[PDB]
Amino acid sequence: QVQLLESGGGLVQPGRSLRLSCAASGFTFDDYAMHWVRQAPGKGLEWVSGVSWNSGTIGYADSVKGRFTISRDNAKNSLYLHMRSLRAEDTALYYCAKAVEMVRGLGADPEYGMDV
Amino acid sequence: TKCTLKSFTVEKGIYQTSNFRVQPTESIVRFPNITNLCPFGEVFNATRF
Q: Glycosylation: which residues (chain B)?
């Protein structure tokens, strides 16, 4: 089965750094892109970042670009996103999602049509 | 024949002298289809890291 376990956040006073971790299964890690997409409780979903088969990260969202730092632990299927200055715009449900497209989605990594 | 019979005088007849032997022109190597193709798009030909 598939159940992507993401956590790392909690009673976080703004102005501190953390490492949100998503663990994923049901596929091959170092050949599929895990994407951070935030969704605050009461607010719509919003894309954060991603990491691909070549670890091909892309960027961060509107006012958060730069404070975050995206890193992958390919073996144990883990994804660590750095948390800096988490405020009402920077806090949300940091969903981790997988795109269905296989290698060379075109040039870009598989990052569209992530229904899971 | 003169240096085969070891003589400066050879009489009418027939004398085996040497060994005719054709030589190989070129070399040839064969092996079935590769089927060992690599996804360089993942390894080398990658757009975004």
A: 25, 27, 33, 45
